[PDB]
Structure formats: structure tokens, C-alpha cells
Amino acid sequence: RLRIGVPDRASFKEFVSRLDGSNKVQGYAIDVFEAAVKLISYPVPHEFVLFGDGLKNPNFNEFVNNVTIGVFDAVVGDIAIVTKRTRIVDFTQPYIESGLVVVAPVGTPIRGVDTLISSSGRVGFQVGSYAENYMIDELNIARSRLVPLGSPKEYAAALQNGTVAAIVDERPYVDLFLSEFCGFAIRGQEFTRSGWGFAFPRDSPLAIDMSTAILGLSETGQLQKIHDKWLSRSNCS
Ligand code: MET
Ligand SMILES: [Cl-]
Numbered sequence: 001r002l003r004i005g006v007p008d009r010a011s012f013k014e015f016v017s018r019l020d021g022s023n024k025v026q027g028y029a030i031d032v033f034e035a036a037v038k039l040i041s042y043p044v045p046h047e048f049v050l051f052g053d054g055l056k057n058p059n060f061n062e063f064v065n066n067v068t069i070g071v072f073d074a075v076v077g078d079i080a081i082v083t084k085r086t087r088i089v090d091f092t093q094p095y096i097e098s099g100l101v102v103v104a105p106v107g108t109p110i111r112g113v114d115t116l117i118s119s120s121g122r123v124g125f126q127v128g129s130y131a132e133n134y135m136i137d138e139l140n141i142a143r144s145r146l147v148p149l150g151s152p153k154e155y156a157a158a159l160q161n162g163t164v165a166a167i168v169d170e171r172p173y174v175d176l177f178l179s180e181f182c183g184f185a186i187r188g189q190e191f192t193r194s195g196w197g198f199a200f201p202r203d204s205p206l207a208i209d210m211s212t213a214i215l216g217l218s219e220t221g222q223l224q225k226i227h228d229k230w231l232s233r234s235n236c237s
Contacts, residue, residue: 001045005072006030007063008052011151012173014230015078018050025050028230032095033076033198035222036213044206056150057128064089064199074200080170081194082130090207094195095214095223096172100131102187103174104166105159112188117141121165124149124158131168134192156181175233182236
């Protein structure tokens with residue numbers, strides 16, 4: 001029986017979240033995982049364990065580290081495949097493209113990651129995201145400029161009342177945000193490229209077998225249909 005960690009997301013619950021009146025889980029990443037398990041040649045008995053304080057998204061670096069220390073046999077969620085995590089776990093091949101973008105109010109001076117860096121303005125990020133350490137370590141954005149944000153309603157409010165000048169987050173969250181809230185746009189293109197995967201212990205054969213199962217979902221069209229089930233774009237209006 002695999003003890004599978006699942007993030008107890010406080011927002012963008014479409015990706016993965018607690019089933020409201022229980023300890024059960026649901027979402028895009030859960031449906032991908034359960035669909036993929038059906039295509040594995042051998043049994044993968046499992047149970048899901050929620051991770052997080054229940055008030056804000058968990059820290060995904062700490063979440064993934066729970067596989068390294070044996071608390072979880074695997075983690076399933078909207079987990080970016082970023083270099084420092086691949087040191088301590090084996091990921092599947094990605095099941096969705098993702099990377100960091102800048103989002104700002106339509107008509108902003110900010111044109112992309114370069115004008116964000118040279119700006120004085122505060123920058124929002126999603127609490128628990130690898131974006132926080134990427135901005136501090138790789139882009140050398142002052143920690144004093146970063147504001148944690150919890151939800152798309154908070155993104156819209158922080159951009160509109162000038163708590164932040166811009167938000168850096170991964171494309172899939174930004175796509176849901178822009179489907180709900182008017183007046184904002186992606187500035188520039190992705191400046192990272194790391195999809196989402198599931199994570200297993202170093203040298204786990206399941207990381208490879210689950211890659212083949214994810215590919216099988218892609219080739220049958222199930223993977224696109226699971227995205228359409230949870231993440232269908234719409235008019236902010
Ligand atoms: C807070 S968003 C979920 C975490 C983000 N996708 C990451 O892998 O860091
Ligand atoms: Cl990276």
C-alpha cells in the first residue's frame with residue numbers, strides 16, 4: 001500500500017484539493033493519477049494523505065521532501081519538475097507543460113521578466129511555489145519585494161489596489177486566473193520551462209512505469225479530456 005501525499009490546496013482547488021466534507025481528495029492531478037494507475041501492468045494499491053496546514057497552500061519543496069524521508073511513498077499533485085527537487089526524488093515525465101510568466105494590469109510599464117527585475121515594484125507569487133526561491137536565487141529579486149498571494153481573487157485585488165506591480169506564477173494558474181478576472185495580461189513569454197509530474201523515491205521503477213501510463217493517456221485523448229473536465233478556459237466577462 002503506497003502512502004501518497006496530496007497537497008491540501010487552499011486555492012485553485014481544481015488542480016487537487018480535499019473533498020469538502022471528508023479526508024478524500026479530487027481534482028485534475030488526482031484524475032490523471034487514477035487514470036494512469038489503470039494502465040500500469042501491476043497493482044498500485046494506494047491511499048491519499050493530505051499535506052498542509054489547511055489555511056494556505058503547503059510548501060511544495062517540503063512536500064516533495066516527505067518522499068525523501070519516507071513519510072510518503074509518492075506525491076501526486078501540481079508538482080513542478082525543478083532542478084533542486086530532481087536531486088531528492090525521481091519524477092515522471094511531465095503530464096502538463098508549465099513555466100513561470102509575468103502577469104500585470106493591461107497597460108503596465110512592465111513588458112516581461114527583464115523590466116520586472118529592474119523595477120522597484122513589489123512582485124506577488126503563489127504561496128508554496130518554487131517561484132519564491134527562483135526569483136530570489138536565480139533572478140536576484142530582493143526578498144523585500146516579494147508578496148505571498150493565496151488565490152486568484154487575491155491576485156486581482158493585489159494588482160488593482162497596487163499591493164504588487166506584477167505577479168510571477170506558473171502558466172496553468174495564470175490561465176485560470178485570466179479566465180475569471182478582467183484587466184490583466186501575461187507580459188512576455190515563459191522564462192522557465194518545467195512541466196508537472198508525480199514524484200517517487202530515487203530509482204523507483206514506478207516513475208518510469210507511470211511515464212508510460214501518462215503517455216498512454218495522452219495517446220488515447222484521456223489526458224486532454226481530464227484537462228477539459230477541470231480546467232476549461234472561459235471569458236473573464
Ligand atoms: C503553490 S502552486 C503549487 C506549487 C507549484 N506548482 C510548485 O511546484 O512549486
Ligand atoms: Cl529549475
